[PDB]
Design a protein around this nucleic acid. Structure first.
Lengths: 80, 91, 97, 101
DNA sequence: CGCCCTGGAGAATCCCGGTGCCGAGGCCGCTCAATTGGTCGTAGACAGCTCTAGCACCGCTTAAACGCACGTACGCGCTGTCCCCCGCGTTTTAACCGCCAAGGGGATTACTCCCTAGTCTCCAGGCACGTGTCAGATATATACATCCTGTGCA
DNA sequence: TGCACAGGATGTATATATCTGACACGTGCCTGGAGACTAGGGAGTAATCCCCTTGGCGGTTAAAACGCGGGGGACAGCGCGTACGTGCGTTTAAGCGGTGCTAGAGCTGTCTACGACCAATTGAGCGGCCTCGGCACCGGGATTCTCCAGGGCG
């Protein structure tokens, strides 16, 4: 039940500090939350597709990396 | 079980360039992902280029032109230079 | 006399502090229950390895920072210091989304 | 091996057999794996020397992912080569806007 | 004295015929890879067994999140300014044809050898793995080293 | 009585033995290296034909180029206030040390469907062709649609 609220407002403020933002408005914390909600669906969906094709009940790192491979992001590091 | 990586080769080239500074394991995995990715890059481009010429054979020509078109003029220029030097010296 | 900084001073030192740190800015448990929440309505009774979670969180953080940079530049194009809801849509749709 | 007589490092046999089992074409030439090992060795040497000097700037004898990150981002040919690549534990560049000063 | 609302005017648009024009499709001639069957040998699914990290959990241990109070300063609304590009008329050039007819080289099709490598084969060796050893970080004797206390004195 | 001192009772950096982590070196079984046979795929040539140029006069048209008016819209100046920036104390909950499991991840024989490889037919699909009904462009006319001048109204 409603785990999307798990991201704290100071966390979005710190992510804004990483991007070089000085002053932040109110609706930024909602908009960034929604964009994350869509992104996690757009990835996790393909991650479940590959897992279902591989006949596995557990999601591995190769599933995530190969899931971000076809989208052009090509996540390096873990599961390379 | 067994696995294959570029570790020893990256360490040898490291000794050929700067035989002092070491390499962390994670950065070594990043280099493994880089070489493994470029391998599929040049190989796939050589496959499509071989398909455009209606030929079933992939030679050093396809790799030369492919490397030329998929890389900037500097990296393709030096890559074709040293590559043709190594191949011509080999044969 | 209390010692208080003028507004806008702590933001700079916060930028200096966080831009020098490679640590993850999101806690593990909320992202865990969030990923599991997204995975509930797709395939019931799944399992997540100890890995691949830091890859999702790492790509989310690294991508969202770049999104905050492009959105920041979009806010600079409007000649102000404040990021607005329309800036995220501008810098979002203008990237091909 | 034929890599030593040609002045190479990476093995030619692994790349040749990998291209054979890679389902690319029916016929494979004998100069293609040597050429590919030459290009890959050149690029790998470039990344190793650039990340090496990047480690020399921070006065560290080991290469952290941040040194490779700044080494790739600071070069124009490497940034244009891979613009979509996400490096883990590499951080970002110290980019500070002038109007915010 | 000067501004919303109305009315006259003008032109840009929509839609419906009305006839010349050309390539979509049909039709045929033709012709070549799909289809059918046989052979053959070969990797994939079925267990089989195993083993190992994910799972669910419990309890210190701090540490960010949060609620709020103050605040001050920039986003915003408003106003005056002025200048720059649109609308239109007049000037200036790009491109088509007529004259007046010729070739030209480069991809295409067909033919023709010839030799580099797939395939098979055996011999060897090399890097993933196990172990040795020092570097760095850790936890503890220790020889003084600074208050506290008897403690004797002038 | 007020005072200096000789020694114990605690700290504290200082020096020494001790605990992970990562580099460094010594192996042997699935890899590569290499030798010989087959052969069809690649390098080379002989017409070829076919659309693509060569060079420049003129006459004329539609498109490009310039020139000015000014109207409205970009843009500088400036005051406001509430919306976040900044600073405290108080809470919930992740980090992390440690634990008992298991159920799914992961390497290995069997054979058996079952698809890879190869002759024979042909018919459905591709090169060639030649028409006409849908399409291209514009007049006729109605319709809407915006532009400008009072004037009744402030």
């Amino acid at each position: 039940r409603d785990n999307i609220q798990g991201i704290t407002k100071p966390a979005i403020r710190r992510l804004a500090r990483r991007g070089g933002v000085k002053r932040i408005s109110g609706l930024i914390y909602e908009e960034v939350r929604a964009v994350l909600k869509s992104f996690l669906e757009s990835v996790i969906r393909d991650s479940v597709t590959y897992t279902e094709h591989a006949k596995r009940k557990t999601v591995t790192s190769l599933d995530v990396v190969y899931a971000l491979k076809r989208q052009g992001r090509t996540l390096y590091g873990f599961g390379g | 079980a067994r696995k294959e990586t570029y570790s020893s080769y990256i360490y040898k080239v490291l000794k050929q360039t700067h035989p002092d500074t070491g390499i962390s394991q994670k950065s070594m995995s990043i280099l493994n992902s880089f070489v493994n990715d470029i391998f599929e890059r040049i190989a796939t481009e050589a496959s499509k280029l071989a398909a455009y010429n209606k030929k079933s054979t992939i030679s050093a020509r396809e790799i030369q032109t492919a490397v030329r078109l998929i890389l900037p003029g500097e990296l393709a220029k030096h890559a074709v230079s040293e590559g043709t030097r190594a191949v011509t010296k080999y044969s | 006399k209390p010692h208080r900084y003028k507004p806008g001073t702590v933001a700079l030192r916060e930028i200096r502090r966080f831009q020098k740190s490679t640590e993850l800015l999101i806690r593990k448990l909320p992202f865990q229950r969030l990923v599991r929440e997204i995975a509930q309505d797709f395939k019931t009774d799944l399992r997540f390895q100890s890995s691949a979670i830091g890859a999702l969180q790492e790509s989310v953080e690294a991508y969202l920072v770049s999104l905050f940079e492009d959105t920041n530049l979009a806010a600079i194009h409007a000649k102000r210091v404040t990021i607005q809801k329309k800036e995220i849509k501008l810098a979002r749709r203008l990237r091909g989304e | 091996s034929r890599s030593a007589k040609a002045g190479l490092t990476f093995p030619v046999g692994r790349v040749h057999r990998l291209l054979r089992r890679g389902n690319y074409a029916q016929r494979i030439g004998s100069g293609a794996p040597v050429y590919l090992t030459a290009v890959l060795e050149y690029l790998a040497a470039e990344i190793l020397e650039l990340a090496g000097n990047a480690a020399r700037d921070n006065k560290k004898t080991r290469i952290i992912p941040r040194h490779l990150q700044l080494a790739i981002r600071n070069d124009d040919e490497l940034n244009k080569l891979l613009g979509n690549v996400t490096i883990a534990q590499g951080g970002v560049l110290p980019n500070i806007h002038q109007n915010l000063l």
